Amino acid sequence: MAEPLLVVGLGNPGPTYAKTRHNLGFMVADVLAGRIGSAFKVHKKSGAEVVTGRLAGTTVVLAKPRISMNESGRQVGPLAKFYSVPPQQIVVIHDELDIDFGRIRLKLGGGEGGHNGLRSVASALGTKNFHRVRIGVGRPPGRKDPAAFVLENFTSAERAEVPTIVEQAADATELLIAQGLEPAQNTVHAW
């Protein structure tokens, strides 16, 4: 056993939320599984969905939580001990408010901003040192509040651009793993 890696995506359960701005993390994950072969199934001694296999040159483990978020770290902590994994070999995908609509950036460490799920995770592990993949959506109209703006649907002109963007994020995840942080930062960035 050469000591593996663990990849994770964030979102909420049901038909009611399937296509809001806050569910982007779920969409990129259904695609990666189609590039491997099989479908999901529940892990009984923790309670979540999992898939195992081969990718970009090495041994990998994939997942999706099943609870409302201010309650989502009670299943991520236990899963990490069952297989004996270090904190520097963990990767996570989510949505971002401080960048324009159609941009991507990579990172290690720092502050959590305004996402509720990110804080629940670092509080169960005991530290803030893990890797991240950011995707932006913009700022609110006038005097409209930030927590109500992310639960709505997209407008019509933004709707014909979404399937193109989901493809570019998957290609970028395979490169971090097979080449490294500093060099992969030189092809995708600006200023």
Residue 106 DSSP class: E
- For 103, the token pair is 């941009």
**Active-site pick, 22, 43, 94, 131:** 22
CA 19 to chain centre: 16
CA 102 to chain centre: 17
Measured in angstroms, the resolution is 2.7
Please, what CATH class does the domain formed by 1-191 belong to?
Answer: alpha beta
Angle between helix 24-34 and 162-179 (nearest 10): 70
Q: Is 115 helix (H, G, I), strand (E, B) or coil?
A: coil
Residues 17, 92: Cα–Cα separation, whole Å: 21
CA 109 to chain centre: 15
Residues 6+ apart with CB under 8 A from 114: 97, 146
Would you call 22 a catalytic residue per the annotation?
Answer: yes
- For 3, the token pair is 């000591």
- For 151, the token pair is 């639960």
